[PDB]
């Protein structure tokens, strides 16, 4: 369909879900899916992505998302390879009523193949600006 509308509706869904049920966030992904939600090493360098629904789940729960409140200030979305949709997102996130922090995020939504209008998140790249800059 319309890449703009697909990406706008996915972002709403993602951040609704991150708030209401983060234990089910992992359902957006598949076996090849890449995920990072910021963080950094013992060397102070940004944390590596993990892959697949199972590892993505173990990682979402280590973030201990509770009352995750998000303000989205930019969303764009565009047709990419194979009628996929790339989504750029900037906004602010507070988890557990902690600091309001700025983030830069990219998504790639890929058609699942089975039905019109069914996608999965092939890539989810989130970074907080305070960890990188």
């Amino acid at each position: 369909p319309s890449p703009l509308l697909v990406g706008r509706e996915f972002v709403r869904q993602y951040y609704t879900l991150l708030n209401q049920a983060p234990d089910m966030l992992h359902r957006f992904y598949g076996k090849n899916s890449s995920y990072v939600h910021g963080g950094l090493d013992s060397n102070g360098k940004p944390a590596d992505a993990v892959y697949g629904q199972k590892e993505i789940h173990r990682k979402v729960m280590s973030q201990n998302f509770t009352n995750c409140h998000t303000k989205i200030r930019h969303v764009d979305a565009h047709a990419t390879l194979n009628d996929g949709v790339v989504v750029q997102v900037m906004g602010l996130l507070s988890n557990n009523n902690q600091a309001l922090r700025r983030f830069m995020q990219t998504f790639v939504l890929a058609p699942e193949g089975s039905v019109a209008n069914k996608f999965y998140v092939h890539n989810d790249i989130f970074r907080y600006q305070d960890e990188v800059f």
Binding site: L5, E9, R27, Y29, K54, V115, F119, V121
Partner: peptide, 9 residues
Amino acid sequence: PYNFIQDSM
């Protein structure tokens, strides 16, 4: 419309 959700694993 628009489904984004997949089966568990």
